[PDB]
Amino acid sequence: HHHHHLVPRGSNPPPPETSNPNKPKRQTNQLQYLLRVVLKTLWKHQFAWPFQQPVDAVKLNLPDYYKIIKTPMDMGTIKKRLENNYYWNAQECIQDFNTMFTNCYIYNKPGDDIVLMAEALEKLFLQKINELP
Template identity: 30%
Template sequence: MTANVDGRPLYPAFQFLPSKRRYPDYFSVIDSPIDLKIIAQKIQGGEYTHLSELDKDLSNMVRNACLFNEPGSQIYKDAKTLKKIIQVRKQEIEQHGRSGPAKTSERIRSKRTSRVGPA
């Protein structure tokens, strides 16, 4: 599932933490910086044992964006939209569980197949 607004993906602003050089105040204002890359690493490392742990990190990411950015800014609006999407998806998972086995990304599958040596 890719979250889009008007055909524009929401994830780019949340993919990586802000640059310390460009936004030095971010790291003094935000106590617990987190981005989608960190969350993905935690997922791949099996660090989340419950949906609530993942939800906490995603909510923290959204909260950080709203705290640091001005209301009305694009990132602030995108964070609010992302929050709604996260809430809806969480409710779907809680009500119906996963719809089938976990899906592996194409990138991960290609890494796995490239490691296979000669038979």
């Protein structure tokens, strides 16, 4: 038989939602600080770039990524969520940050460059989190 299964092809999943009209939302000073100070300083860092958008498993050649990571998260998604006032409190936003870092440590091993980048950002994240209102 001549069907060699060259199609159907692989793909990336739909990225996480940055809007939800029915979701409860607020603008708190902690959430404003998370956008104004915490997100924007992590975003400017030289190790930020791999975390600034959802993982493209096809482009980056990580076809096992969404087999292992079932709750993906990135700083681009958190930035859009903060800009759209998507969160109810700081805990929801901080949990997204925690998910992003945890995904990186689950998927990769100690010593990998991406983990060294994640640890540096987490170190810096936790310092900025200590100065929350």
